[PDB]
Enzyme design. Structure first.
Site, PDB file in Angstrom:
ATOM      1  CB  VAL A 227      -7.003  -6.061 -24.452  1.00 27.71           C
ATOM      2  CG1 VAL A 227      -7.523  -7.019 -25.530  1.00 27.71           C
ATOM      3  CG2 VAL A 227      -6.480  -4.766 -25.057  1.00 27.71           C
TER       4      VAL A 227
ATOM      5  CG  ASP B 215      -8.192  -1.147 -19.078  1.00 27.72           C
ATOM      6  OD1 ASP B 215      -9.391  -0.812 -18.986  1.00 27.72           O
ATOM      7  OD2 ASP B 215      -7.670  -1.492 -20.159  1.00 27.72           O
TER       8      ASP B 215
ATOM      9  N   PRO C 256     -10.591  -1.500 -26.627  1.00 22.66           N
ATOM     10  CG  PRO C 256     -12.490  -0.198 -26.994  1.00 22.66           C
ATOM     11  CD  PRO C 256     -11.445  -0.999 -27.719  1.00 22.66           C
TER      12      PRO C 256
ATOM     13  CG  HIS D 188      11.555  -6.013 -25.546  1.00 26.84           C
ATOM     14  ND1 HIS D 188      10.297  -6.530 -25.762  1.00 26.84           N
ATOM     15  CD2 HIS D 188      11.371  -4.737 -25.129  1.00 26.84           C
ATOM     16  CE1 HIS D 188       9.390  -5.618 -25.459  1.00 26.84           C
ATOM     17  NE2 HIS D 188      10.014  -4.522 -25.074  1.00 26.84           N
TER      18      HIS D 188
ATOM     19  CG  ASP E  46      -2.114   5.744  -3.470  1.00 26.45           C
ATOM     20  OD1 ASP E  46      -2.402   4.550  -3.255  1.00 26.45           O
ATOM     21  OD2 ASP E  46      -2.520   6.679  -2.748  1.00 26.45           O
TER      22      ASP E  46
ATOM     23  CG  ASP F  91       8.526  -9.163 -26.419  1.00 28.99           C
ATOM     24  OD1 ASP F  91       7.852  -8.383 -25.702  1.00 28.99           O
ATOM     25  OD2 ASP F  91       9.658  -8.875 -26.858  1.00 28.99           O
TER      26      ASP F  91
ATOM     27  CB  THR G 136      -0.953   0.005   1.198  1.00 26.50           C
ATOM     28  OG1 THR G 136      -0.209  -0.245   2.396  1.00 26.50           O
ATOM     29  CG2 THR G 136      -2.037  -1.056   1.036  1.00 26.50           C
TER      30      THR G 136
ATOM     31  CB  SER H 101       8.020  -3.150 -22.890  1.00 23.48           C
ATOM     32  OG  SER H 101       7.731  -2.875 -24.240  1.00 23.48           O
TER      33      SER H 101
ATOM     34  CG  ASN I 180       7.370   3.009 -24.093  1.00 23.49           C
ATOM     35  OD1 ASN I 180       6.630   2.789 -23.137  1.00 23.49           O
ATOM     36  ND2 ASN I 180       8.200   2.094 -24.581  1.00 23.49           N
TER      37      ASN I 180
END
Length: 279
Positions: free
Chosen positions: A177, A200, A175, A69, A260, A39, A16, A224, A161
C-alpha cells in the site's frame, strides 16, 4: 483551473516550490472516481461536499461523525474548497468511534467491506481508499490492507505520528500500500511524522485547513492530514487516465518533487506528492 487563496497544502501539491497560495489542477477534478474514507465518518450534509459525500457503512450506533477527524480527512480528499479532487464521489466507512478509536477487528472488516462494496458503486475512473488510522504492528491488519489493494483499490495509509520508524505500525508497514508521511509549509518533515524505508511519499500534514463537523472548518496536523492529499491526488490522476489503482503509488513517487524536503532521515524517501499539472 486555478483556486486562489487555497490552503497551503493544495497549492503545494501543484507547485515546484513552497510558498505559493494558488492551487492549479485539471478541471476534470476526479469526476468519475470514488474515494472511501475509512475513519470516524463524514458529515455528508456539510455544504463543502455538495451532495457528493455519503455514509455507506458503520459498525457503531450511528454513521454520523461525532468526532470531526473523518470529516476533515474527507474534506482534504474532495471538498469544494479544501479538497484535492473536487468532483470525486466520497464514501464514508465508520470504523472509528466518536473518540477516534477502533478495534483492529473492526478496521479489518471495514477494509474487506470496501473491497466488496466498490462493486456496488459507479466508479468508472477507479477507486481509492484513504486510511488515516493505525496502531502497533499487526500482520492481520497489514494483510487486510494488502487484500484491499489487490482487489483494485488504491490504498493510501498514514505513516503515523510517533516520530519513529513506521515499520512498527500497521497498516503503515504493509509494503503493497501507499504509506504517507507528513511535511510542513516550509518543506520540512513534520515534527511528528514517522519515517523509514516503508514510506512511499510525503504530503502536506502540518496546519491543514479542512472541513469539520457542525458545518465548520479548522486547521489540524498529522499524517492523517497528509494521507488524504495523496488519496485525492490518486483519484485525480486516475480520472485523467495517467495511472491505475495498482500503479498510482508508484506513479506518484515517479512524478514527485524530489530532494526538496529537510530533516528526512537517511534511508527514507525524499519525495513530495505533486500533480505535475501544467496550466
Amino acid at each position: 483551473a486555478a483556486q486562489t487563496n487555497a490552503p497551503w497544502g493544495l497549492a503545494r501539491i501543484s507547485s515546484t516550490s513552497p510558498g505559493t497560495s494558488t492551487y492549479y489542477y485539471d478541471e476534470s477534478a476526479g469526476q468519475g472516481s470514488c474515494v472511501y474514507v475509512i475513519d470516524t465518518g463524514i458529515e455528508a450534509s456539510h455544504p463543502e461536499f455538495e451532495g457528493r459525500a455519503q455514509m455507506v457503512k458503520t459498525y457503531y450506533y450511528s454513521s454520523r461523525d461525532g468526532n470531526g477527524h473523518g470529516t476533515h480527512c474527507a474534506g482534504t480528499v474532495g471538498s469544494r474548497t479544501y479538497g484535492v479532487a473536487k468532483k470525486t464521489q466520497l464514501f464514508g466507512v465508520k470504523v472509528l468511534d466518536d473518540n477516534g478509536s477502533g478495534q483492529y477487528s473492526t478496521i479489518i472488516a471495514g477494509m474487506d467491506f470496501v473491497a466488496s462494496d466498490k462493486n456496488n458503486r459507479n466508479c468508472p475512473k477507479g477507486v481509492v481508499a484513504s486510511l488515516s488510522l493505525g496502531g502497533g504492528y499487526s500482520s492481520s491488519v497489514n494483510s487486510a490492507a494488502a487484500r484491499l489493494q489487490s482487489s483494485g483499490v488504491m490504498v493510501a495509509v498514514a505513516a503515523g505520528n510517533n516520530n519513529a520508524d513506521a515499520r512498527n505500525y500497521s497498516p503503515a508497514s504493509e509494503p503493497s500500500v501507499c504509506t504517507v508521511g507528513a511535511s510542513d509549509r516550509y518543506d520540512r518533515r513534520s515534527s511528528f511524522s514517522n519515517y523509514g524505508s516503508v514510506l512511499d511519499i510525503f504530503g502536506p500534514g502540518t496546519d491543514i485547513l479542512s472541513t469539520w463537523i457542525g458545518g465548520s472548518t479548522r486547521s489540524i496536523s498529522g499524517t492523517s492530514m497528509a494521507t488524504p492529499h495523496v488519496a485525492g491526488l490518486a483519484a485525480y490522476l486516475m480520472t485523467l487516465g495517467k495511472t491505475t489503482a495498482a500503479s498510482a503509488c508508484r506513479y506518484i513517487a515517479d512524478t514527485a518533487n524530489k530532494g526538496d524536503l529537510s530533516n528526512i532521515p537517511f534511508g527514507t524517501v525524499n519525495l513530495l506528492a505533486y500533480n505535475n499539472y501544467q496550466a
